[PDB]
Design a protein around this motif. Structure first.
Motif, PDB file in Angstrom:
ATOM      1  N   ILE A  84      29.649   4.556 -64.657  1.00  0.00           N
ATOM      2  CA  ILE A  84      31.133   4.602 -64.338  1.00  0.00           C
ATOM      3  C   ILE A  84      31.488   4.715 -62.842  1.00  0.00           C
ATOM      4  N   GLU A  85      32.332   3.691 -62.467  1.00  0.00           N
ATOM      5  CA  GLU A  85      32.596   3.581 -61.020  1.00  0.00           C
ATOM      6  C   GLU A  85      34.095   4.112 -60.790  1.00  0.00           C
ATOM      7  N   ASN A  86      35.026   3.578 -61.602  1.00  0.00           N
ATOM      8  CA  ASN A  86      36.385   3.886 -61.462  1.00  0.00           C
ATOM      9  C   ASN A  86      37.035   3.714 -63.041  1.00  0.00           C
ATOM     10  N   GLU A  87      37.139   4.947 -63.355  1.00  0.00           N
ATOM     11  CA  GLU A  87      37.439   5.288 -64.868  1.00  0.00           C
ATOM     12  C   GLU A  87      39.156   5.433 -64.767  1.00  0.00           C
ATOM     13  N   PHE A  88      39.913   4.158 -64.824  1.00  0.00           N
ATOM     14  CA  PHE A  88      41.200   4.427 -64.773  1.00  0.00           C
ATOM     15  C   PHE A  88      41.975   3.268 -65.798  1.00  0.00           C
ATOM     16  N   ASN A  89      41.353   3.021 -66.897  1.00  0.00           N
ATOM     17  CA  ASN A  89      41.651   1.698 -67.440  1.00  0.00           C
ATOM     18  C   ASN A  89      42.474   2.262 -68.836  1.00  0.00           C
TER      19      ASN A  89
ATOM     20  N   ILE B 257      38.793  -2.323 -74.534  1.00  0.00           N
ATOM     21  CA  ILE B 257      39.740  -2.156 -73.532  1.00  0.00           C
ATOM     22  C   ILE B 257      39.624  -2.945 -72.180  1.00  0.00           C
ATOM     23  N   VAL B 258      40.793  -2.984 -71.451  1.00  0.00           N
ATOM     24  CA  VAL B 258      40.806  -3.646 -70.176  1.00  0.00           C
ATOM     25  C   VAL B 258      40.830  -2.728 -69.252  1.00  0.00           C
ATOM     26  N   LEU B 259      40.237  -2.810 -68.114  1.00  0.00           N
ATOM     27  CA  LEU B 259      39.960  -2.295 -66.749  1.00  0.00           C
ATOM     28  C   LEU B 259      40.898  -2.811 -65.772  1.00  0.00           C
ATOM     29  N   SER B 260      41.351  -1.689 -65.031  1.00  0.00           N
ATOM     30  CA  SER B 260      42.389  -2.557 -63.944  1.00  0.00           C
ATOM     31  C   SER B 260      41.859  -3.368 -62.977  1.00  0.00           C
ATOM     32  N   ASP B 261      42.663  -3.975 -61.924  1.00  0.00           N
ATOM     33  CA  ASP B 261      41.906  -5.083 -60.974  1.00  0.00           C
ATOM     34  C   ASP B 261      41.537  -6.161 -61.909  1.00  0.00           C
ATOM     35  N   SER B 262      42.179  -6.655 -62.971  1.00  0.00           N
ATOM     36  CA  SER B 262      41.736  -7.798 -63.720  1.00  0.00           C
ATOM     37  C   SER B 262      40.314  -7.574 -64.084  1.00  0.00           C
ATOM     38  N   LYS B 263      39.649  -6.468 -64.472  1.00  0.00           N
ATOM     39  CA  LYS B 263      38.367  -6.289 -64.975  1.00  0.00           C
ATOM     40  C   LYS B 263      38.435  -6.373 -66.501  1.00  0.00           C
ATOM     41  N   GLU B 264      37.858  -7.464 -67.453  1.00  0.00           N
ATOM     42  CA  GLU B 264      37.845  -7.513 -68.692  1.00  0.00           C
ATOM     43  C   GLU B 264      36.524  -6.827 -69.384  1.00  0.00           C
ATOM     44  N   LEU B 265      36.471  -6.075 -69.999  1.00  0.00           N
ATOM     45  CA  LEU B 265      35.519  -5.089 -70.935  1.00  0.00           C
ATOM     46  C   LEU B 265      35.659  -5.616 -72.308  1.00  0.00           C
ATOM     47  N   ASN B 266      34.375  -5.829 -72.721  1.00  0.00           N
ATOM     48  CA  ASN B 266      34.229  -6.361 -74.423  1.00  0.00           C
ATOM     49  C   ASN B 266      34.323  -5.161 -75.193  1.00  0.00           C
TER      50      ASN B 266
END
Lengths: 645, 111, 647
Positions: free
Chosen positions: B66-71, B22-31
């Motif tokens: 979890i801080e901002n779950e909108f991915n 999954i990829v998180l908003s604001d250019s946050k990359e999760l493996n």
């Protein structure tokens, strides 16, 4: 085949064409004047025969039945799990060959398999003479079974993967291993009986079945009589057959009781018995009346049934039995002996953990029994000291690699269903919470399986006693500073148990500064109150969302307003974005055509009760009636079942 | 590879061995990570609670807060059995259901 | 290795596996444990008699003459004194003893007078015979025959055979021991060990053997352990005398003075070779498979679940039609067979007889339904069918068949089964008795065993029916007429008064016990044990899936049950067995069908597959064909169908 011995304790004549010798013997047993008719030695023979028959529970014929007690008693220490007693008994020097046989069986039960194999080898060496070849044959069979168990345990356990330890703690070194293979290079068990002396084959014919791979096919096949739907019975005779098999296999110190086939047979028989009893009860209440029979099932369960269930059942099997064959409507029998068994197994597990003498071979077998017993103890009522002891053993000394925090919480919650929470085990839980709090001081994070953590315990405590303040955690968090971050998170997770000064100390650290920060605070419920500042933050969040026009966030505030947590009519102006927002903001004007009852599957008990008591009722009842009439789903049926009607 | 998946109607989701990039908003990359769902209808808390089930996201085998779950930008779904790209299955099976988490690795029942 | 050596090892392995192997232990094995030899004793006797020894004067006859002279001159006390002085010590056992005992010999014949072989049995019971009175008072059927009278009773010289006087009167003094040894050699397969080719005992045995007929006995095996490899002429001469020699120095190179290594190498090869199958080319694999499978050609159909018993748990035969390697340590004969199946070109690599055997194996395996391995399995689909008129219940056809004239034993067997299903049990028993009496001329005996089983089952059914009729004759019948004659029942009771069904299989020839291993399960409830348990487990799964509301979109787990069900029915209806008339079978069929119907009804309705998962997951479906209706009608009661309709 001259006589058939009905398990109630009777004899019947079927295939005897000569004199009725058994009838004459029992006639001699009945009368007393028939004595002194024998030439002395025959009187001694009759006395010995009478003693043997009385020990084995054979009494009279079928025509002379005087009601049957059918009391079952097993006098083997290995069955009751008196581990300390057998461990002490092993130490004492032996006197006779049978004493060494019992010692070897006890050693095999306790997991010291190398010593058991050596003792069996010594026994087979010594007892080759005399006419007591029964011990020699039994020792041969037990040695072969021990070798098979050792090889299977090495193959499945040694190698093939294990996450509990990196290395297996050397399950028997390569000196003890690779030597049994030399001694059993081409051992054959099928010809063991045929090579015996002809007098052994003439006398001990009944033991031949001990040399076969499968020897319990008859009972498994005969189990089919319990699934008949047609309206002594079959359950009673099946139960005595199971008891007889268990007693024969345990009293004679045979290792075959620790195999897969026997466990499968016990599980199948017990499950079928319980299912048949439940079906009979439900048919009786269906066809005649509700409370005519005393709302109690006829399957009165006692010590031995509980022992068998705890020992031979896995967790999944017990779960299936509970789900399909609800046990809360059938009562338990003896309670003092069950409580003694539970306190004894708790003492055994605490001794195993404290002394660090974890025999992996014994530990693997014992932990399943411990888990099953502690799971099934929910239906039994225990004294204060026993409950405290078992709770301390489960929370403190239970290995972490098997039960996590969530599983331990599930076990504890199931334990206190019908016993409530007095002060003692509450203090024990406090000693756990403080202990956990300490373990927190570090790069350490708790790991759970079902997603439950230590805070649940506090919630349960706060559920059962609302006026509790812990001084130890208050003192711990009083000196707490801001350098640490994970521990302070743990204290926020356990907020309501702290004193007023500690409450202020932590509340100073609480700082709402952003809507996502408010979300984070309300996940653990740090901000139980709703200040106007938080309300204004919600107002600006909704305004930004509205002027902006993925995931779902408005649902939480919708629930909150429908739960009267927000006492302000401000968000009614925000409509047209999503359906449920208007549903839980404007119930009168909501368009029910867009409704989908799938949301009803993600509603907890409190929300369902709230919506059930609000009138909205008939629309949802109609759509869920349509859903259940289309597809027969259990969730919608239950929702209609308990709440809406 | 579609034989392993199972549909659960108690909570109306799916269970299937799969891994999410999954990829998180604001250019946050999760493996690579996977979802875990637990069903607990007998909850103790009140007032602030609004759900019945607990959903966690596990990354490489360790928990993440979890801080901002909108991915809501899909994921590079792969079937770890033989490393097959099953991203198409997830993306065109997601919108067909109203559940916020259509795919969950394993579910746990605490009834 | 040499071809003849391979053949000898194969024969030895076969004899040992069949339980017909006996060992003739020599004196070298006892010497290996540093036991004092006879030449030391003769040297001591020579020193005591004259005063000085001499190496030159020592021949074969001197070893037997000098002790005789000592006994004649000095007397008897001195002889036993020297014997006790040189024989009182005790020595440890030898690894060769353990290796030879691990070969599982039926009997052990030794010409030693020691106890090393005795103390080697590790945990094995052997009856020791060393005197003449001990032959009659044997306690078991396994013989440790010490020919020359070991020292168990004492150390006197009268209990042994050492001097020339004892050798000359050996036949007169020990008739029973010699006769027992001769008959043991005649019956079993005998392997010598630890013997020199020029020994007196071997020469006496050859002289006795020369008196027998040319083809009336089997050639005994011999093992030679000498530093010098055997010469061609000596080998030919001794082979022509009726003794098959296996050399040790030829196979393994070693120095002159080393003895343990040759024995250990030979015994290690013998021990390792038993579990190994010497198959390298397609011909050998095909011949081995044919040897294993061909006895099963008599029966029409064999179920796949117990096929693993034929191969000794070497391959798990899955019910759907796939095979999986389980414990085949050696060559993968199944892999080679399936490779030959998948390629038509390699079929030309075999001779005509092997090619026709492969064709027969293909026919048999395709009939039984075995397709290919798990890896090669794709989307295979299997249908079911039954080729028995009894199952379909065409009663007029079977009546017309029973009106026809018998033509063969198998036709009579079919007629007997069909007539038994017709209810005329008296004629069924009579026909079965006639079949058993007339089936004396046979080559396999499977028909005899099956007919005996059917006869016993028919007798039990007749007794149960005649007992049960009187119970319900008062109310549901009223007439209370027993449809039987007392003469028939009396004859039945007299005939079956001693027939024990438990040991019927044990009394069958060894060939039947080796080939038709699976048929033993037909003698009891064992053949239903391997299925029922599985069913139970599957039930505990399916209901668990039904109460949780889970819809698996893959293969339905009930399929196994269905397959097993049909499989059992076929094996019990195409071989014409009466076990289909029992109660346990009816209950098992009812349970299987009830579980199938419940699972089908539960999966009939779905929620998300209609609207959410409509693009796949369509394979869900349960046809109800003619066979299911027949099975339900045959093995159900009214209340069971009422419960099904209710649920």
């Amino acid at each position: 085949y001259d006589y058939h011995f009905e398990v109630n304790g009777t004899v019947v004549r079927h295939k005897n064409k000569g004199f009725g010798y058994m009838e004459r013997f029992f006639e001699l047993k009945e009368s007393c004047d028939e004595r002194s008719k024998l030439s002395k030695k025959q009187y001694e023979r009759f006395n010995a025969l009478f003693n043997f028959f009385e020990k084995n529970g054979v009494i009279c014929m079928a025509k002379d039945a005087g009601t049957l007690n059918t009391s079952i008693e097993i006098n083997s220490l290995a069955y009751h799990g008196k581990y300390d007693v057998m461990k002490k008994f092993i130490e004492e020097q032996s006197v006779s060959i049978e004493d060494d046989y019992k010692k070897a069986f006890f050693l095999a039960c306790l997991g010291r398999w190398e010593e058991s194999y050596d003792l069996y080898s010594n026994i087979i060496l010594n007892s080759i003479d005399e006419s007591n070849g029964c011990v020699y044959y039994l020792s041969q069979i037990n040695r072969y079974r021990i070798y098979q168990s050792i090889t299977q345990a090495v193959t499945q356990f040694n190698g093939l993967g294990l996450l509990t330890f990196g290395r297996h703690y050397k399950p028997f070194t390569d000196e003890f291993l690779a030597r049994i293979e030399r001694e059993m290079t081409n051992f054959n068990i099928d010809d063991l009986f045929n090579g015996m002396p002809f007098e052994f084959q003439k006398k001990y014919k009944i033991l031949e079945f001990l040399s076969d791979n499968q020897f319990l096919y008859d009972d498994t096949v005969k189990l089919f009589e319990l699934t008949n739907k047609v309206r002594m019975s079959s359950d009673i005779v099946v139960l005595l057959r199971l008891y007889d098999n268990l007693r024969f296999l345990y009293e004679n110190c045979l290792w075959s009781v620790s195999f897969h086939e026997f466990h499968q047979y016990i599980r199948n028989s017990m499950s079928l018995l319980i299912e048949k009893a439940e079906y009979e009860r439900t048919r009786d209440i269906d066809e005649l009346g509700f409370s005519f029979f005393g709302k109690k099932s006829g399957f009165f369960m006692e010590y031995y049934d509980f022992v068998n269930i705890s020992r031979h059942f896995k967790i999944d099997d017990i779960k299936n039995l509970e789900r399909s064959c609800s046990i809360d409507k059938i009562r338990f029998g003896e309670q003092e002996k069950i409580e003694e068994y539970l306190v004894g197994i708790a003492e055994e597990i605490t001794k195993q953990f404290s002394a660090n003498g974890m025999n992996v071979v014994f530990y693997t077998q014992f932990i399943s029994e411990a888990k099953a017993a502690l799971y099934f103890a929910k239906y039994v009522k225990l004294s204060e000291e026993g409950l405290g002891k078992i709770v301390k053993a489960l929370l403190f000394y239970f290995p972490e690699r098997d039960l996590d925090i969530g599983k331990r919480y599930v076990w504890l919650e199931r334990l206190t269903k019908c016993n409530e929470l007095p002060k003692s085990i509450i203090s024990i839980i406090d000693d756990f919470l403080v202990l956990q709090a300490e373990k927190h001081i570090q790069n350490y994070s708790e790991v759970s399986s079902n997603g439950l953590y230590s805070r649940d315990y506090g919630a349960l405590i706060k559920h059962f006693e609302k006026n509790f303040i812990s001084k130890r955690l208050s003192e711990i968090t009083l000196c707490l500073t801001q350098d640490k971050q994970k521990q302070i998170d743990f204290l926020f997770k356990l907020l309501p148990l702290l004193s007023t000064n500690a409450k202020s100390h932590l509340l100073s650290f609480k700082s709402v500064e952003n809507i996502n920060d408010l979300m984070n605070g309300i996940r653990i419920g740090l901000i139980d109150e709703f200040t106007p500042e938080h309300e204004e933050l919600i107002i600006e969040y909704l305004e930004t969302r509205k002027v902006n026009y993925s995931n779902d966030y408005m649902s939480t505030f919708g629930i909150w307003y429908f739960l009267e947590e927000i006492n302000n009519s401000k968000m009614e102006e925000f409509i047209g974005m999503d359906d449920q927002y208007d549903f839980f903001v404007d119930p009168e004007n909501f368009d029910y055509k867009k409704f989908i009852p799938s949301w009803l599957k993600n509603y907890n008990d409190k929300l369902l009760g709230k919506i059930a008591g609000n009138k909205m009722k008939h629309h949802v009842i109609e759509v869920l009636k349509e859903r259940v009439k289309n597809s027969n789903d259990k969730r919608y049926l239950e929702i209609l079942m308990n709440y809406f009607i | 590879a579609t034989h392993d998946l199972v549909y659960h109607s108690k909570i109306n989701t799916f269970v299937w061995d799969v891994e999410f990039d999954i990829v998180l908003s604001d250019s946050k990359e999760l493996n690579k990570c996977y979802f875990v769902k637990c069903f607990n209808p007998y909850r103790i808390n009140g007032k602030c609670d609004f759900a019945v089930s607990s959903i966690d996201i596990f990354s490489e085998g360790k928990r993440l807060l979890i801080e901002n779950e909108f991915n809501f930008k899909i994921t590079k779904a792969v079937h770890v059995a033989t490393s097959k790209d099953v991203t198409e299955i997830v993306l065109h099976l997601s919108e067909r259901i109203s559940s916020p988490f259509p795919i969950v690795k394993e579910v746990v029942y605490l009834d | 290795l040499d071809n003849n050596v391979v053949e000898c090892i194969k024969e030895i392995t076969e004899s040992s596996r069949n339980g017909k192997l006996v060992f003739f232990v020599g004196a070298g094995v006892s010497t290996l444990s540093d036991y004092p030899q006879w030449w030391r004793l003769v040297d001591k006797y020579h020193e005591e008699l004259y005063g000085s020894p001499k190496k030159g004067n020592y021949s074969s006859d001197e070893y037997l003459r000098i002790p005789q002279i000592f006994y004649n001159v000095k007397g008897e006390m001195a002889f036993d004194g020297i014997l006790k002085d040189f024989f009182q010590v005790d020595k440890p056992t030898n690894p060769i003893h353990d290796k030879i005992l691990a070969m599982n010999p039926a009997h052990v014949i030794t010409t030693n007078y020691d106890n090393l072989i005795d103390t080697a049995c590790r945990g094995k019971y052997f009856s020791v015979i060393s005197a003449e009175e001990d032959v009659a008072n044997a306690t078991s059927s396994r013989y440790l025959l010490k020919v020359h009278g070991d020292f168990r009773k004492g150390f006197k010289g009268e209990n042994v055979v050492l001097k020339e006087d004892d050798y000359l009167n050996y036949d007169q003094n020990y008739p029973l021991i010699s006769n027992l040894m001769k008959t043991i050699i005649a019956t079993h397969t005998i392997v010598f060990i630890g013997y020199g080719l020029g020994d007196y005992n071997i020469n006496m045995l050859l002289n006795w053997v020369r008196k027998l007929q040319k083809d009336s006995f089997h050639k005994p095996f011999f093992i030679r352990t000498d530093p010098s490899p055997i010469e061609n002429e000596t080998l030919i001469y001794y082979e022509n005398k009726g003794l098959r020699i296996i050399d040790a120095a030829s196979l393994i190179d070693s120095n002159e003075y080393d003895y343990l290594e040759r024995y250990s190498a030979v015994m290690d090869l013998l021990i390792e070779s038993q579990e190994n199958k010497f198959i390298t080319k397609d011909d050998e694999v095909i011949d081995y498979i044919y040897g294993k499978i061909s006895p099963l050609f008599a029966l029409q159909y064999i179920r796949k679940i117990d096929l693993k018993h034929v191969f000794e748990y070497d391959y798990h035969f899955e019910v759907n039609g796939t095979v999986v390697r389980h414990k085949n340590k050696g060559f993968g004969y199944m892999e080679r067979f399936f490779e030959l199946k998948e390629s038509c070109d390699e079929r030309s690599k075999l001779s005509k007889k092997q090619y026709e055997r492969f064709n027969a194996l293909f026919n048999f395996f395709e009939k039984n339904g075995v397709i290919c391995m798990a890896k090669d399995a794709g989307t295979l689909n299997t249908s079911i069918e039954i080729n028995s008129l009894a199952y379909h219940g065409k009663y007029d056809v079977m009546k017309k068949f029973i009106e026809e004239q018998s033509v063969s034993i198998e036709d009579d067997y079919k007629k007997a089964f069909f007539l038994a299903c017709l209810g005329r049990w008296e004629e069924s028993y009579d026909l079965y008795s006639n079949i058993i009496l007339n089936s004396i001329d046979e080559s396999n005996g499977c028909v005899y065993y099956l007919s005996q089983i059917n006869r016993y089952r028919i007798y039990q059914s007749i007794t149960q029916a005649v007992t049960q009729f009187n119970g319900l004759g008062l109310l549901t019948f009223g007439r209370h007429y027993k449809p039987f004659t007392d003469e028939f029942l009396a004859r039945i009771e007299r005939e079956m008064t001693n027939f024990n069904i438990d040991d019927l299989f044990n009394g069958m020839p060894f060939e039947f016990q080796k080939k038709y291993k699976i048929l033993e399960f037909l003698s009891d409830n064992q053949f239903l044990y391997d299925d029922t348990v599985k069913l139970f487990e599957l039930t505990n799964k399916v209901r668990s899936e039904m109460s949780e509301g889970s819809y698996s979109f893959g293969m339905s787990s009930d399929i196994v049950v269905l397959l097993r069900l049909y499989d059992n029915l076929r094996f019990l209806y195409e071989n014409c067995l009466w076990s289909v008339s029992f109660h346990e079978f009816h209950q098992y069929i009812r349970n299987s069908m009830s579980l199938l119907i419940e699972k089908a009804e539960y999966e009939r309705t779905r929620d998300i597959d209609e609207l959410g998962f409509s693009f796949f997951g369509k394979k869900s479906g349960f046809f109800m064909e003619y066979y299911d209706f027949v099975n339900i009608s045959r093995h159900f009661k009214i209340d069971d169908i009422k419960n099904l309709e209710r649920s």
